[PDB]
């Protein structure tokens, strides 16, 4: 009835600073299907975020891959922020190039 989203933030290609890439926020294991996912660059929301179509897994739980263009740098930060009814507050997960 309430399942907490699991979150992965990670690039499509191995990151190289200055090199255009794709930033992925893969949100899984949640219920109900209604969810709000935001992608952030230096704490401000990225306007052009794409979302996969509603799908669910063998265990009934829903998932969604949100993605956007980014260009990793030495100083810019990237995060994905997820609001869902299972969670008291939005959960923000920063992109870590090591993971």
């Amino acid at each position: 009835i309430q399942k907490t989203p699991q979150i992965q933030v990670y690039s499509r290609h191995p990151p190289e600073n200055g090199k255009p890439n794709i930033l992925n926020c893969y949100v899984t294991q949640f219920h109900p299907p209604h969810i709000e996912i935001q992608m952030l660059k230096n704490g401000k929301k990225i306007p052009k975020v794409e979302m996969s179509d509603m799908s669910f897994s063998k265990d009934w739980s829903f998932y969604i891959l949100a993605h956007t263009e980014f260009t990793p740098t030495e100083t810019d930060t990237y995060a994905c922020r997820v609001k869902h009814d299972s969670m008291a507050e939005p959960k923000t997960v920063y992109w870590d190039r090591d993971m």
């Binding site: 009835i1 992965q8 499509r12 992925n24 109900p32 209604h34 799908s55 009934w60 739980s61 993971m99």
Partner: protein, 252 residues
């Protein structure tokens, strides 16, 4: 080792709106068709390029089923509100999984017909395709109703018949797409030792060196995974895409 599934969802909407019904078909774990009642013109749509081969009568016929299912889920949702004493002021979710597993000879191994309400098991058809397992006392109402009217027989005919025959057709028509693999490219990073497998398809993979992330979509139809440890005394990559397993360690 082949399968077909249809994953169906209806999510009710408080207010004058009717539920949103979505259907997704899979062949060997890959999306091949999709229906969504919120689309501009709701129709089944091809989602694998070998499906654009099906002519207009196929899409017209599938779409009729989806419209039917949409009405079936509306009525079933209303019934569920009654069995569990719930309010239509809230949103509620009904899910179905159905389809068939085949062997490498293309014979039927197993049919599936499963329902969930609010994300938990409600009722399922047993592997015998004759009897039902109900998850709770409410679902036992459904089980007794369905035993009484012999509902299982209709599902068994679909699962042993059309599910199998159409999967053969899709397996044949999608052969070149389905047989395709994308080999992982791997490398090792130091922090913890981390072995990454990248760009692989399909998603099944073994990495051995111990922390291990959930396999995740790269967004281009490929997948990624990685595995890590405590610490060149130390990683193997197993994938049907590979000429042979990959073998590596830290590189400086």
């Amino acid at each position: 080792p082949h399968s077909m599934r249809y994953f169906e969802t209806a999510v009710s909407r408080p207010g004058l709106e009717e539920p949103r019904y979505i259907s997704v078909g899979y062949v060997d774990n890959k999306e091949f068709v999709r229906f969504d009642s919120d689309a501009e013109n709701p129709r089944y749509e091809p989602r694998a390029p070998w499906m654009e081969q099906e002519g207009p009568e196929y899409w017209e016929r599938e779409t009729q089923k989806a419209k039917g299912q949409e009405q079936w889920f509306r009525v079933s949702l209303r019934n569920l509100l009654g069995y569990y004493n719930q309010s239509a002021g809230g949103s509620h979710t009904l899910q179905q999984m159905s389809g068939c597993d085949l062997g490498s000879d293309w014979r039927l191994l197993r049919g599936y017909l499963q329902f969930a309400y609010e994300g938990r098991d409600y009722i399922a058809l047993n592997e015998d395709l004759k009897t039902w397992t109900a998850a709770d006392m409410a679902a036992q109402i459904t089980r007794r109703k369905w035993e009484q009217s012999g509902a299982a027989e209709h599902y068994k005919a679909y699962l042993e018949g059309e599910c199998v025959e159409w999967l053969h057709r899709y397996l044949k028509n999608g052969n070149a797409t389905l047989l395709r693999t994308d080999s992982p490219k791997a490398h090792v990073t130091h922090h913890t030792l981390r072995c990454w497998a990248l760009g692989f398809y399909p998603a099944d993979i073994t990495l051995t060196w111990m922390e291990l992330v959930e396999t995740r979509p790269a967004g281009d139809g490929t997948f990624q995974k990685w595995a890590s440890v405590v610490v060149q005394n130390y990683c193997r990559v197993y994938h049907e895409g590979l000429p042979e397993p990959l073998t590596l360690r830290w590189e400086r």
